[PDB]
Amino acid sequence: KGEELFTGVVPILVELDGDVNGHKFSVSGEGEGDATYGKLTLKFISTTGKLPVPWPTLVTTLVQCFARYPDHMKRHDFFKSAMPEGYVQERTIFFKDDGNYKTRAEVKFEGDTLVNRIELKGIDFKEDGNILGHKLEYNGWCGDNVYITADKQKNGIKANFKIRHNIEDGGVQLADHYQQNTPIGDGPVLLPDNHYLSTCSKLSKDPNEKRDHMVFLEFVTAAGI
Numbered sequence: 001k002g003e004e005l006f007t008g009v010v011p012i013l014v015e016l017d018g019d020v021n022g023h024k025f026s027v028s029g030e031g032e033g034d035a036t037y038g039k040l041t042l043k044f045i046s047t048t049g050k051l052p053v054p055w056p057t058l059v060t061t062l063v064q065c066f067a068r069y070p071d072h073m074k075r076h077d078f079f080k081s082a083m084p085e086g087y088v089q090e091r092t093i094f095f096k097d098d099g100n101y102k103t104r105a106e107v108k109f110e111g112d113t114l115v116n117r118i119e120l121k122g123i124d125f126k127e128d129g130n131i132l133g134h135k136l137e138y139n140g141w142c143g144d145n146v147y148i149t150a151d152k153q154k155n156g157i158k159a160n161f162k163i164r165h166n167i168e169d170g171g172v173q174l175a176d177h178y179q180q181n182t183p184i185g186d187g188p189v190l191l192p193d194n195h196y197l198s199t200c201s202k203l204s205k206d207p208n209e210k211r212d213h214m215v216f217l218e219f220v221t222a223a224g225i
Contacts, residue, residue, distance in 0.1 A: 053125075070221075078148075093176065104119050106184065136166070155191070
């Protein structure tokens with residue numbers, strides 16, 4: 001089964017080609033995931049200089065197949081069921097009173113490595129706003145539970161959740177996520193009952209890293225059934 005591919009530690013590679021208000025950037029990430037613990041340890045670097053947007057706004061875009069689905073919920077794990085062929089993950093992220101990200105990604109196995117290749121398009125961002133102005137706290141932000149629902153029409157799922165970024169000096173910048181995932185292959189997948197993913201993240205910095213970067217720790221676990 002697809003879940004058998006996640007029994008141990010799996011290496012991860014991430015690639016993101018971004019474009020925000022016509023300003024292009026590129027991020028390369030790598031690390032490992034341990035679905036048994038819903039644990040992700042990843043590091044991301046910008047290869048194109050300082051990012052035009054804050055790192056926290058890219059976290060959700062930069063591998064939910066590593067969520068821990070407890071034994072009693074494994075029937076509802078769409079992400080692993082679509083492996084190894086993978087799935088397309090599309091999102092529209094509305095930043096309240098600001099621009100929006102539109103993202104399309106392929107999450108699939110290349111060899112023994114889980115790969116996440118992303119194309120991101122951002123438009124309508126305010127130069128004097130919280131995003132382009134880099135006013136979002138690096139760890140001052142909390143992510144609501146990722147509420148997942150089946151999308152039988154497309155043999156996939158949909159997800160909805162808000163990310164709440166603390167603004168430096170006060171305030172919260174909301175990011176409304178609208179998500180859709182579709183399998184790449186034709187094989188049968190697991191269409192889940194309503195549930196959610198509980199997430200916990202920690203951003204940090206590598207003191208040896210010279211490039212604009214983000215060290216990333218995440219725990220993600222399924223619940224709600």
